[PDB]
Amino acid sequence: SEVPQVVSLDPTSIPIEYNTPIHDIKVQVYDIKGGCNVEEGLTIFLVNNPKENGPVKISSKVNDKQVSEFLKDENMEKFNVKLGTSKHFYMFNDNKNSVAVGYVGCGSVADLSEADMKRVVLSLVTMLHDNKLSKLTVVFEINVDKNLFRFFLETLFYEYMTDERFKSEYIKHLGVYINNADTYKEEVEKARVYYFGTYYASQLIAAPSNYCNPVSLSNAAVELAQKLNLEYKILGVKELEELKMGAYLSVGKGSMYPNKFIHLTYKSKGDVKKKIALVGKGITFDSGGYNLKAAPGSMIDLMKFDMSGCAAVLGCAYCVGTLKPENVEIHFLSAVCENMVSKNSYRPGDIITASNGKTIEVGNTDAEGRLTLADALVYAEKLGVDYIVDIATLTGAMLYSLGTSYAGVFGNNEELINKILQSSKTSNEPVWWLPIINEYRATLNSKYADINQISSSVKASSIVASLFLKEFVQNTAWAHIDIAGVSWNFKARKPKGFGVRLLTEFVLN
Amino acid sequence: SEVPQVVSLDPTSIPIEYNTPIHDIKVQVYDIKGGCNVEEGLTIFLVNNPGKENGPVKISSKVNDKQVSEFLKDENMEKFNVKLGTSKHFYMFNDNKNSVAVGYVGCGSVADLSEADMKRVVLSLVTMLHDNKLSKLTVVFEINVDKNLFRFFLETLFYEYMTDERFKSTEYIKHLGVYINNADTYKEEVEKARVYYFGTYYASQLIAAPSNYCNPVSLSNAAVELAQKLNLEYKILGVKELEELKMGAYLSVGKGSMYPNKFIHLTYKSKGDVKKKIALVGKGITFDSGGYNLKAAPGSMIDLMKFDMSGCAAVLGCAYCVGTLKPENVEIHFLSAVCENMVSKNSYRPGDIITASNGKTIEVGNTDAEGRLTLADALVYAEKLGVDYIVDIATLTGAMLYSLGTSYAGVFGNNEELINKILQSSKTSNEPVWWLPIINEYRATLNSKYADINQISSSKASSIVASLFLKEFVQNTAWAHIDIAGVSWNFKARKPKGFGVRLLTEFVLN
Amino acid sequence: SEVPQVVSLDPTSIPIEYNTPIHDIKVQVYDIKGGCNVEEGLTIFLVNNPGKENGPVKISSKVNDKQVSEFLKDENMEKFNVKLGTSKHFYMFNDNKNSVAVGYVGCGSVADLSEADMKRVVLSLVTMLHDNKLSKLTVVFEINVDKNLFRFFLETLFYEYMTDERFKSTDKNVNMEYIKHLGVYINNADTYKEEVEKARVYYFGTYYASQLIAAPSNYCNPVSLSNAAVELAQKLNLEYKILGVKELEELKMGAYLSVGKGSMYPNKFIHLTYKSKGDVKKKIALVGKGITFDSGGYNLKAAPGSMIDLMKFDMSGCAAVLGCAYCVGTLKPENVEIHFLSAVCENMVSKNSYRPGDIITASNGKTIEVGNTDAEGRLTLADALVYAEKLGVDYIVDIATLTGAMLYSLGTSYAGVFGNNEELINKILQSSKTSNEPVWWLPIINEYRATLNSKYADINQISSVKASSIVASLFLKEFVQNTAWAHIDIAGVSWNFKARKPKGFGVRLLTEFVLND
Ligand SMILES: CC(C)C[C@@H](C(=O)N[C@H](C(=O)O)c1ccccc1)[C@H](O)C(=O)NO
Numbered sequence A: 001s002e003v004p005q006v007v008s009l010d011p012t013s014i015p016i017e018y019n020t021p022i023h024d025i026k027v028q029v030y031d032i033k034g035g036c037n038v039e040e041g042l043t044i045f046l047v048n049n050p051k052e053n054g055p056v057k058i059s060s061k062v063n064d065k066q067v068s069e070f071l072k073d074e075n076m077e078k079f080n081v082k083l084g085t086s087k088h089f090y091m092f093n094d095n096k097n098s099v100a101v102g103y104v105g106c107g108s109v110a111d112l113s114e115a116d117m118k119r120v121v122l123s124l125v126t127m128l129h130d131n132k133l134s135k136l137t138v139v140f141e142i143n144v145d146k147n148l149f150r151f152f153l154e155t156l157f158y159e160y161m162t163d164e165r166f167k168s169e170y171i172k173h174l175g176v177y178i179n180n181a182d183t184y185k186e187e188v189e190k191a192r193v194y195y196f197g198t199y200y201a202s203q204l205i206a207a208p209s210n211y212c213n214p215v216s217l218s219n220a221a222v223e224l225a226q227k228l229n230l231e232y233k234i235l236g237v238k239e240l241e242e243l244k245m246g247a248y249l250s251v252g253k254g255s256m257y258p259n260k261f262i263h264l265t266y267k268s269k270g271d272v273k274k275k276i277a278l279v280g281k282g283i284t285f286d287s288g289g290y291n292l293k294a295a296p297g298s299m300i301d302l303m304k305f306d307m308s309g310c311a312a313v314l315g316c317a318y319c320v321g322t323l324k325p326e327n328v329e330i331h332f333l334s335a336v337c338e339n340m341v342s343k344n345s346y347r348p349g350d351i352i353t354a355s356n357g358k359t360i361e362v363g364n365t366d367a368e369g370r371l372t373l374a375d376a377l378v379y380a381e382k383l384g385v386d387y388i389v390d391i392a393t394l395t396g397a398m399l400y401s402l403g404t405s406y407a408g409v410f411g412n413n414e415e416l417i418n419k420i421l422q423s424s425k426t427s428n429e430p431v432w433w434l435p436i437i438n439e440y441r442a443t444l445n446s447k448y449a450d451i452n453q454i455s456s457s458v459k460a461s462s463i464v465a466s467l468f469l470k471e472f473v474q475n476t477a478w479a480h481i482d483i484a485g486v487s488w489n490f491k492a493r494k495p496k497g498f499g500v501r502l503l504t505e506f507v508l509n
Numbered sequence B: 001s002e003v004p005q006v007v008s009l010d011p012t013s014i015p016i017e018y019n020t021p022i023h024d025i026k027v028q029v030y031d032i033k034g035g036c037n038v039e040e041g042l043t044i045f046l047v048n049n050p051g052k053e054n055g056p057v058k059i060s061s062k063v064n065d066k067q068v069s070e071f072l073k074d075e076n077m078e079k080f081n082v083k084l085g086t087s088k089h090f091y092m093f094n095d096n097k098n099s100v101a102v103g104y105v106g107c108g109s110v111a112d113l114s115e116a117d118m119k120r121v122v123l124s125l126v127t128m129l130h131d132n133k134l135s136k137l138t139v140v141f142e143i144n145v146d147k148n149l150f151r152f153f154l155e156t157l158f159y160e161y162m163t164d165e166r167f168k169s170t171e172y173i174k175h176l177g178v179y180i181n182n183a184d185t186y187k188e189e190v191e192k193a194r195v196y197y198f199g200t201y202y203a204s205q206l207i208a209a210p211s212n213y214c215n216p217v218s219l220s221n222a223a224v225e226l227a228q229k230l231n232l233e234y235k236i237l238g239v240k241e242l243e244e245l246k247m248g249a250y251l252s253v254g255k256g257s258m259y260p261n262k263f264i265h266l267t268y269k270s271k272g273d274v275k276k277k278i279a280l281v282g283k284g285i286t287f288d289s290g291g292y293n294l295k296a297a298p299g300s301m302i303d304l305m306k307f308d309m310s311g312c313a314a315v316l317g318c319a320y321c322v323g324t325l326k327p328e329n330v331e332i333h334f335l336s337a338v339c340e341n342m343v344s345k346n347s348y349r350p351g352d353i354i355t356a357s358n359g360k361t362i363e364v365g366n367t368d369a370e371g372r373l374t375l376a377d378a379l380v381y382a383e384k385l386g387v388d389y390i391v392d393i394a395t396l397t398g399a400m401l402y403s404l405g406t407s408y409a410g411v412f413g414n415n416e417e418l419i420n421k422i423l424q425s426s427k428t429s430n431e432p433v434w435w436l437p438i439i440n441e442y443r444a445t446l447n448s449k450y451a452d453i454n455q456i457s458s459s460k461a462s463s464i465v466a467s468l469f470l471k472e473f474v475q476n477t478a479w480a481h482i483d484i485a486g487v488s489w490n491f492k493a494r495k496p497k498g499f500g501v502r503l504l505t506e507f508v509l510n
Numbered sequence C: 001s002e003v004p005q006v007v008s009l010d011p012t013s014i015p016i017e018y019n020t021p022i023h024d025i026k027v028q029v030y031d032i033k034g035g036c037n038v039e040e041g042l043t044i045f046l047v048n049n050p051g052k053e054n055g056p057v058k059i060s061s062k063v064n065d066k067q068v069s070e071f072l073k074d075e076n077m078e079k080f081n082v083k084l085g086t087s088k089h090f091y092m093f094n095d096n097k098n099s100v101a102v103g104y105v106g107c108g109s110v111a112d113l114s115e116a117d118m119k120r121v122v123l124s125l126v127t128m129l130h131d132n133k134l135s136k137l138t139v140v141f142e143i144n145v146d147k148n149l150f151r152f153f154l155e156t157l158f159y160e161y162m163t164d165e166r167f168k169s170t171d172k173n174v175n176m177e178y179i180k181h182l183g184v185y186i187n188n189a190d191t192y193k194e195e196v197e198k199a200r201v202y203y204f205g206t207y208y209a210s211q212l213i214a215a216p217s218n219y220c221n222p223v224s225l226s227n228a229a230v231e232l233a234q235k236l237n238l239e240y241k242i243l244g245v246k247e248l249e250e251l252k253m254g255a256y257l258s259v260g261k262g263s264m265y266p267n268k269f270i271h272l273t274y275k276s277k278g279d280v281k282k283k284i285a286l287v288g289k290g291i292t293f294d295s296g297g298y299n300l301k302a303a304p305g306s307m308i309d310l311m312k313f314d315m316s317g318c319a320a321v322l323g324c325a326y327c328v329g330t331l332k333p334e335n336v337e338i339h340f341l342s343a344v345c346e347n348m349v350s351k352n353s354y355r356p357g358d359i360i361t362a363s364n365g366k367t368i369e370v371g372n373t374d375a376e377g378r379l380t381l382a383d384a385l386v387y388a389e390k391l392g393v394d395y396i397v398d399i400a401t402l403t404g405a406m407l408y409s410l411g412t413s414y415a416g417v418f419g420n421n422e423e424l425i426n427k428i429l430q431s432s433k434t435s436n437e438p439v440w441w442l443p444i445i446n447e448y449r450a451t452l453n454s455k456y457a458d459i460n461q462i463s464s465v466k467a468s469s470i471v472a473s474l475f476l477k478e479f480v481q482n483t484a485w486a487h488i489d490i491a492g493v494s495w496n497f498k499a500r501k502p503k504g505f506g507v508r509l510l511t512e513f514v515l516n517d
């Protein structure tokens, strides 16, 4: 619980913003039928043109003569609907009050993807960050379903919010005009919850490794559990030794921060008809160990993000703990540690023993995630659960295979895999199914240990890692989500909080 | 048609073996319900034991010989186990008092065998064939296989048994017996397998041929020769017709070569009425040096890059199978933009803007991404034919080794139905393929400042970005792209797989 | 003159846009003391707030419209701040009940705008011009600018506003609509009026240079580049001469000829000349590196970071020289004779290429040991400098994308200048100040000269002292015997990586140099 320090100026906790300006925003949703009022603030129309880079056309009654003249076809024709393009103007309305009116181009395709919507939102966020507004009103002259509408709000809330914890005028009202308004009203408060779960997770990821270490991360986890009335249990070195979790403990041998195993539990006050375990990779810093990240491209300044899985899980815990779904018992697990170089570090070639008795030959100390997850997976299966889903920034190959938008899912069960893809669809956190190819299993056959940590090959590293993990689930439906490529937003230089909404939709639906 | 030379010792054709020792093998299939006869040669029993770890081998099959039956009694066989890949050889005398040889191959613990360890089963069998000067091989199936897997057994047996000695200078069986239950249903698979094998081995021959032998002219010559031995309409476009067709992307790639570009266009048409028109496109880079983006990086594998025409080989390999089996109600076009990517005073340069045959201007960012340039023009041509399906197959991106590896190929496309047909074809051909996404969000990375489009991204999903490129040259036709860069070469055996041939033939047949 | 081809689809000339939409813009400058008329298009105020960091916006120019004046009152305007780069659009009706567009661009709180600051200001202006279909732009200067800062505003505005579509076919922009009129309100307008057409000229010289650079190497080759230059000389009535290979052979330019040996394109030496109608008090030779593509040769650019796709850029010096030729040929300065020189070739990999280790002989007799074929620029420049000095000139200034080390030394904004004469260098610095193309003076360190001592040849091409920009300047110095000479290394500043396009760097610098003596 007490965070060790090297000098007195070393941080002993992660700063967390719980009450964000987003929570102060009153959201009202109206149906476009009946006309739009353009009293105060900034009003943005979401317009497309099914053709490409075509002219903007507003087709919604505006209960204001002055702003209608502005929105006349001849004047709006100036402007085009290219995805992400926007223009906003300041003017006097009938009350000659100063109002701002504009649009965001939504391309030429009727059905907007999650990527398209983000681009729509970022442009919207760009106008909000340069204006001293009181109210933002968005008019939907495009087609979006209930899930995409919620995705819109979530993304708006998340991108609008700015993290100033390590640094030394937000809108107070949000208006929305849409067709089946009464059907969309319920998605508003769900978005507000999903946003913070993601933003909460983001905060942990963005937290530098001197702030976010195994001790402070587990401490932060306990505090969240306490605020939500979740049962919690933190395993220390002595208990981990008694549980024989040698793989997980080996990775952390070289750290000044003691290993901390995070175990939260949500249990429903009804009948329990589904037990789910969520496992997140919690490497507070990945130096690579003795296989130090020194090669051109390793991105070592990166590696505080190696606990993104843990963040997604804790972020998920917030959402579930807030929404309190029925008929479920959920375990939020993370084997948290730090992978460092020391006199005490574990070595390449070392043979270590996991909690299920299997000996593992370490071939690369930078492949630390599968070791911590292995012992985490054994712990999970002993709980007697229906599904085990782990989420991890495991392999960089994901950047070459799937890139920065879609995460990969691996598994031993097609039904479980299918539930994750559906959750990807309704949460709009894109996931693609990748195969666990049994032919590669032999490359993990060690000469001295029961199994290799790695293949001698760089061929199919994400798949080989899934084969490894597969060895630590005996008789349980299990899935593995590799978020190494999608976790960090390189363009915006911040986390995405990837996985929080995905996992929440999985538990709820 | 005439291959240019630098010295008089430069080869002017690819040596091709059409009649292989496999074709000389008389194959007979009998039903197990009648007993197995021995007498001659080597007889191998394929045995498993479902539900035991490495259980004892037990023969299940009446042997029409009293004392090879006594030899095969369980007390004698309990010794031995069915561990996958395990094999033993037996010497004994039959009823007549003559010397016979018998043995077995273990098929593991799983009732339903692999696609991969059927390969190991076959590989184990071939071990028995290489160190032996046998005249007859007999295989008894005491495992259960469906119609597709049996054909696959023969194909793999044929392919692995065969040895390529075309480039060497300074004992094959003549009969194959198969004992299997519902033999009468399986007999139809025998000649289909032999056809599928050679189409694959034919592709293998073209792929294995070094680049001084296999160049744009000689490969195109070989394609013409194939069209003639089959009876397909054929036409080869040289530099002059290609200029008239304005195929600037394809022509740029070959500018630095001593070998003129040759576009291969074979056609199979059924005498029936035609309900499906299909264009099959293969990447045909006879050698990929990388150009001015020279392969000087450590993982470049500059020595194996004769393999960069695997797509073309798969397409031509398919052409053999289709041309022999003569399917109904279908019209097939075999297309390949064949050229060589070299470094020269005449070679295309990084930064260059070139114009494709559909009018789109392209900024070349990397000369080693040459395949998509040739395929783009090949794809424009394909759509001009007015077909229902366009499928290209290519060793396009090295990233496939990192994504799917050396066993599974990746398939991309603009049409889910076509993707599923490729997928089904993967199951029945047993050439494993996995569906990968075309992520439209990465399309913006191909937006060039001066040309219509970039050839490459700056940025890493190179396989996905390359597919995004290709999609731009198919406007309104169902199209799929198979990236076999990772699976084309069998690194362990130091030989090609001829991957894609059987997949494409099963694709057109269904 | 005839460009050789590999296939018939190979381009045989560089496409050049001469009549640009910028030239079609009628520009008027009015005095602010008379008030601003707003009544079409978009009207933009360049605003400041001296001493208030992100301070409030306040318009201070009489607006000859009651409705627009009321809109622009301080009470309405304070909601906005003057943050440098900030911009806003306003919609309103004027007294004649017509809809007009008005806005502002923040010019910060610092009285004196830098060259970097002014560009940022302009960039924000062009954004308002893009994606909007305006017919008129009116710009109001509520800041203080001298004439060459004012001129810099128009040049940069013109340059950034213009979009190059020579190589688009199926993706030309559907919405490219240029304004037809440009209005400017400024104090003491009669003093600034002279800068307008000077800006237009400075703009095109720069854009012409940008066009040559942006043109890919299959379009822009040694032959096609010399041809456009000749066509350029003809349109300006300049004396011109292009040297082919065996004229170069019998001027014995072995270094220059070596670089092009591996190319399918013959070497072409550009020699354009401007002579004043009057008596000549200054003779100047301008020498530009003209490598239409730098592959590196047998020292191939294969290392991570070599940026081989960008190397069609290697003739930026040459382009800067021709862009200057345009400006000089148009403005017709007095008492001056200018030689515009460029030894053009392409550095390629071939059986005919020159090799590392080769000893070659320059036109002044000095033998050179080649240590790196990617150090080709100094070889072509060596012979060009000898040619230049034989012209009997007073100042020789060469401009070249010579060393990537400039990225490590000065970065992407400032070019480096080397020289053998302080008077010339300062003139370069003075022209840099008035052209607003930033240049910094770097030393030629003689102690490093010994690293060029070859065992067999008279001199080494390169060092074995990783201070490469200085070593290269030491090399170049060896081919100038008794003439004031300066060397401007633009390897770091020529290409705009963010905007993914050329800068046309050097044109305004070189022209201001010629104009001010
Ligand atoms: C340049 C294209 C990407 C193709 C190229 C290739 O993949 N080169 C690279 C390499 O071998 O290091 C590489 C591999 C994986 C990921 C990125 C880059 C392959 O040689 C080819 O010629 N394909 O047509």
Ligand SMILES: [Zn+2]
Residues within 6 Å of the ligand: A286, A288, A365, A366, A367, A368, A369
């Ligand atoms: Zn690691």
Ligand SMILES: [Zn+2]
Residues within 6 Å of the ligand: A283, A286, A306, A368, A369, A393, A394
């Ligand atoms: Zn890690």
Ligand SMILES: [Zn+2]
Residues within 6 Å of the ligand: B288, B290, B367, B368, B369, B370, B371
């Ligand atoms: Zn290549």
Ligand SMILES: [Zn+2]
Residues within 6 Å of the ligand: B285, B288, B308, B368, B370, B371, B395, B396
């Ligand atoms: Zn290739």
Ligand SMILES: [Zn+2]
Residues within 6 Å of the ligand: C294, C296, C373, C374, C375, C376, C377
């Ligand atoms: Zn060079």
Ligand SMILES: [Zn+2]
Residues within 6 Å of the ligand: C291, C294, C314, C374, C376, C377, C401, C402
């Ligand atoms: Zn150069």
